[PDB]
Amino acid sequence: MICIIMGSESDLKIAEKAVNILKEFGVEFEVRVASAHRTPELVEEIVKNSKADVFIAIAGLAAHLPGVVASLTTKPVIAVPVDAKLDGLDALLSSVQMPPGIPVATVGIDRGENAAILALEILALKDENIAKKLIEYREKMKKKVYASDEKVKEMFK
Amino acid sequence: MICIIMGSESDLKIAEKAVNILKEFGVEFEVRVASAHRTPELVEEIVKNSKADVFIAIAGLAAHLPGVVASLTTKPVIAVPVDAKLDGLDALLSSVQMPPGIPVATVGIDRGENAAILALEILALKDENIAKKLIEYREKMKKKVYASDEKVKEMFK
Amino acid sequence: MICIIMGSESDLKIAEKAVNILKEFGVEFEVRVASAHRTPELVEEIVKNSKADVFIAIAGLAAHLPGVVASLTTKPVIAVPVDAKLDGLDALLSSVQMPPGIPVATVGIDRGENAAILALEILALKDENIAKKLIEYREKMKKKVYASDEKVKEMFK
Amino acid sequence: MICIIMGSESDLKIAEKAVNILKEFGVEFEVRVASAHRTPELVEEIVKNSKADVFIAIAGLAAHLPGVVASLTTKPVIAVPVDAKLDGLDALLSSVQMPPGIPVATVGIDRGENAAILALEILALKDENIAKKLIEYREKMKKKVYASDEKVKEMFK
Amino acid sequence: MICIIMGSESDLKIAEKAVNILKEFGVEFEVRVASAHRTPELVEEIVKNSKADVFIAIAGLAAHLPGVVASLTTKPVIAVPVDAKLDGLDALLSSVQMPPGIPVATVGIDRGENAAILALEILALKDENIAKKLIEYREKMKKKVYASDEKVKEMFK
Amino acid sequence: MICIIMGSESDLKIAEKAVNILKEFGVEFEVRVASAHRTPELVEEIVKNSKADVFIAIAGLAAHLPGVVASLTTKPVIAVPVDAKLDGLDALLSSVQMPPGIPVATVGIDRGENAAILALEILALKDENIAKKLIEYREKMKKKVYASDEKVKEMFK
Amino acid sequence: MICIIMGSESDLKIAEKAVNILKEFGVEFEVRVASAHRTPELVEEIVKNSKADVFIAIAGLAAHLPGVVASLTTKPVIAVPVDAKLDGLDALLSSVQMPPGIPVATVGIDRGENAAILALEILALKDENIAKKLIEYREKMKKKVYASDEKVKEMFK
Amino acid sequence: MICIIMGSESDLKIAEKAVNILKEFGVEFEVRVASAHRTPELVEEIVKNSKADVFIAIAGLAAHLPGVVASLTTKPVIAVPVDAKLDGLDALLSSVQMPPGIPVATVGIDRGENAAILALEILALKDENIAKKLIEYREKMKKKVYASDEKVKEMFK
């Protein structure tokens, strides 16, 4: 089980990048909306009662959701910085620069897909079905690259 | 009453800048240490039971203390970004870029003194003794500037 | 009474975010346009004769309005950095990095709404009607978040 | 098993922060030095034959080690940006901004301790002994904070 | 022979800027697509067997292609940072800040044309036909500038 | 006489901002196009033979025109950084950070109008007709501000 | 006459760089200390009654002195950003990014010497004795460079 | 032949990093000092008469030396940004962001060693003795890495 928490409905586009990946691997997950600032009790309640092995927090601006989620559990918390101002430099450092003792796994700005893959790599350590799918997923990717090469090769001759 | 909360004992130097100002104006205040990440329940407990009209939160790195304090009260929360990495650019945006609805008054990096003055200006709206002291404080400052001018004037002639 | 001063008519969009909030709380306020550079005497005149307990200064670029307003009064001065160039990094530091003795409460870039809320939180210390409205305002916000959660919950099942 | 790889012996100080944490939890680990640029075959060889469930890559400058390690395994790869120039802004984005499909869990600059904790949180999903230790570790941390509060409380009275 | 390698088909626009220059000088070249992260074996294979005297690597984000290409050959490797996020500041430092011993010639962001010219200047050291064309190319450029001057001169009179 | 030099015809929009100001003050000026990189001999020739008391150089990217112009004369050289990449941060520092001995007066990015005004303020020191016009120009500006205030005043009542 | 105004006695080191240059050219000047924030009436008074043809304002942090000085006169105002925080990026943009109509000539951070030279180049337009000295000053500089070349030439042979 | 040009004697430390590399490969080279701003005629004269196949320009601040050198020759010009202010961000973009047609090969800040290696890789295309030495140089480097690994391996057991 993977729990995806959006600090705002504005993070839906990035959150769906994650969901579409999780749906392709056939894994269980939940998608929630909860503000660390506006509804601290909803976040707390979602986290403390979740059965998720991995949390994916998605927020922009002075993104404090990832940090708040991590302070409520010892499960791995992945943060996805969303660019809503200053081209994502706010949400990036606001979530990556956590203090000693309470870490947060940070991925690139708007990288919901990489957040889902990271979460699957963590689960794959216990679920061999997921590990196998990860290897196949990489193969699929090499193949798209070969196809790009083949196509471009026919371009400027 | 003014409540000063440090996210870490590393913020003491900046926190004392604030205290020394509050001591010169003869006003009531409290100085506490509480981590938004490590001890969310201590922060919550300090804020929800404080009698302070103004909160001064001082933290560095991915400073989330100011934000967490503001989400627990409707009283004015002043944040003081502390430079512990990336010359304070982290704690700055992490506290200033709050989301709509839950604001935080931000002052310059390591500006504990300006945080105390801002807090006094807020109290002065209800305490005429403080308002008077603020005006006198400004006069004192102009005088130090005149003295600098007088001194420099005698320098390169 | 709250006094909103725009350094330019270009700041109207951000200034209206503030006004709409003040109108919802039913509080007195004034909206003015005055340049710190082009009309220093109008700014001076507006500030020195205002009956406002809180000043909200809104300017972009090398925003010096907040600083100039604060140097003319001991009342709390809230600055709203407007992004007109360099994605608001100019107006941000130009108003937040004030020197010791003359502080300015800074909120996020284009955050006129947060500027109005901050101003109300200050007034609420003396006006219980405003304090009550602030608490209700927060409740309203939690409710919009719950509604977002409920809606998103029905999305990917 | 956790595999720590340093791109340079210059990363030892940060690498030891990690080791000291792993030693306190009594977990198996390896510490290696391998350059992604100078010895790509050593990195490849270390990764492809490691029995580690989690990789911790530590490099500075145009840090490409984390990325190269992640491209060689599907196991979680944690990157620790080291500040050797431009106050760590190079190694930060160079490792965090990975492309879709090949993610890297990034922690703060020089945060070797947070890298080890993150790795343990991942292992804890399969090792209950580690999960228990994580909870105890957090308790220990709250206690240091309470002690800081108690101490500071006796300071300005 | 010059070998142009794109880390992604998204770099085609910038890659064509290079090709169009190489086509005007009548020199041999190859255009390939290969990901340093997704297909490390294709990159390795392309580089180790290329007969190119100069390599032009074009990638965005945490661009690691230039670095990986340079670690596989002693031939000059020119990197072209592509702006796909953070206005190209990622790919810039990620390729320019190489470590001692394995250098990479970096040109401006999206400067595929300057990458091709740089490559020709290198070849010109051995091919006098190219050296001559470079001098003629510069003359052509001065002429476009004179024409701009002549045109603008007739503008505001 | 004022000499405006554009490093590229791409700087025309910003250059016209300057011209329109100079035309309103009725002063003599020249508008030229010359590249510091592509046509160093045209720049040299224009500068060494100009009768201008003030030079206005307008260039973007790694703007070296201002610097090159200043190294060819002892007359005041005003630089106007043009944002063509990295939101003007390149051309800004590339022209402002001159080395001791050869200064360049720098104005804001794309501020051709401020460049013309600065040039007129310099000429006004010798031409009383220009000095008078500068004072009138400022009056005109205060008046536009008063009109903005009057208009906005009628807005939210 | 040239008027140098320091916003703080902390700017003395940079201010002396300017004075030493002015003393070598044998020109009249004044050195003053006046805060735009703390003593707006002293700044106003100094500027409105100065007989200076050129003003050199030196301030750090959210440097507003240059802007305030320029709003009080039509004489050329040169700003010298002082690095007291964020390596001078605050004072730089805070003074360079002036709004249309009220320009400020900006030189590099801590470049008091370049500020004095710029001021002399302006005066030289009316004082031929200064113009001559500027040309001689440049000759002296070329000579120090030749001497560096001669010395280095004997170094690695 | 390789020509190293320093814009200032302040660049000696970085320039020697280059020389020491060139001395180890036993190749011909010259070390000169010439300012693009202060002595444009010395730079011009050095470049136009040099027999060097590769130019290495080393300058800090608003580094314009690399650009000026490249505008005087069609030979490859390598720039080494020197950090003398703003941690090298000035000299970096000032030399890397060249305009179309006149490229400059840029290496990391203070990377004189990488500048020399890049220059040798260019010469190696015509000198097989240098090509061979480059391959040996890389072997030597792998060996230092293996030695670091061996040493660290014995450290925490």
Swiss-Prot record, chains A, B, C, D, E, F, G, H:
Associated pathway: Purine metabolism; IMP biosynthesis via de novo pathway; 5-amino-1-(5-phospho-D-ribosyl)imidazole-4-carboxylate from 5-amino-1-(5-phospho-D-ribosyl)imidazole (N5-CAIR route): step 2/2
One of the Pfam families matching this protein, by short name: AIRC
GO biological process, one term: 'de novo' IMP biosynthetic process
Keyword Isomerase belongs to the record: yes
Catalytic activity as recorded in UniProt: 5-carboxyamino-1-(5-phospho-D-ribosyl)imidazole + H(+) = 5-amino-1-(5-phospho-D-ribosyl)imidazole-4-carboxylate
Residues that bind substrate: S8, D11, R38
Keywords: Isomerase, Purine biosynthesis
EC numbers, comma separated: 5.4.99.18
Top-level EC class: isomerase
UniProt keyword Cytoplasm, yes or no: no
Gene Ontology MF terms: 5-(carboxyamino)imidazole ribonucleotide mutase activity
Summary of the function given for this chain in its UniProt record: Catalyzes the conversion of N5-carboxyaminoimidazole ribonucleotide (N5-CAIR) to 4-carboxy-5-aminoimidazole ribonucleotide (CAIR).
Family the UniProt entry places it in: Belongs to the AIR carboxylase family. Class I subfamily.
NCBIfam families cross-referenced by the UniProt entry: purE (TIGR01162)
The protein's name in its UniProt record: N5-carboxyaminoimidazole ribonucleotide mutase
Organism encoding this protein: Methanocaldococcus jannaschii (strain ATCC 43067 / DSM 2661 / JAL-1 / JCM 10045 / NBRC 100440)
Taxonomic lineage: Archaea, Methanobacteriati, Methanobacteriota, Methanomada group, Methanococci
